[PDB]
Amino acid sequence: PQITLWQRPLVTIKIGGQLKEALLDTGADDTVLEEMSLPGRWKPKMIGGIGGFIKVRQYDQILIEICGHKVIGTVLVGPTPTNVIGRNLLTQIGCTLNF
């Protein structure tokens, strides 16, 4: 519904049959998850943030359920310290910022 930001906006996701926690990140163009097993054909990618760059595997058309909200989109998998849900999926769940 509506989430304040006094604490990290952590949500439960279900992806690839697995339950995880992930951060809702409006600062992220892309969705980036810690190393995991995704079936299908991926492509090598490199992405950047504060600190520098990492290599990821780009998985397209992956089902993920965010707060029980089904979305299908690209997920990058690689050596990120946390699971980040980026704008590519935040748009599909109709997410906005408000103030």
Add this chain to the structure above:
Amino acid sequence: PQITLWQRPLVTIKIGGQLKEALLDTGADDTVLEEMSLPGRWKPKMIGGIGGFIKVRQYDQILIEICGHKVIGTVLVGPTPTNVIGRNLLTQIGCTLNF
């Protein structure tokens, strides 16, 4: 206002007499600005993100105008490729995520 996320949520800020653009980032605990002179006392800090860690200068009690909303808070200055407004200031403008 309400801001969708089809595009990066970039906003105009006024800080230290200067106008800049910055990213509203719910994934950021802290507010991190590219190099800039700020007056007064500051403390050394390290912060991390997707690719690694950086050294920043921490400034407290700094006035920032974000979309015409004045807030006073801590601002980190350092080698970030982008100006990021983090939750420490997003809360002060009463910002929420909604879906």
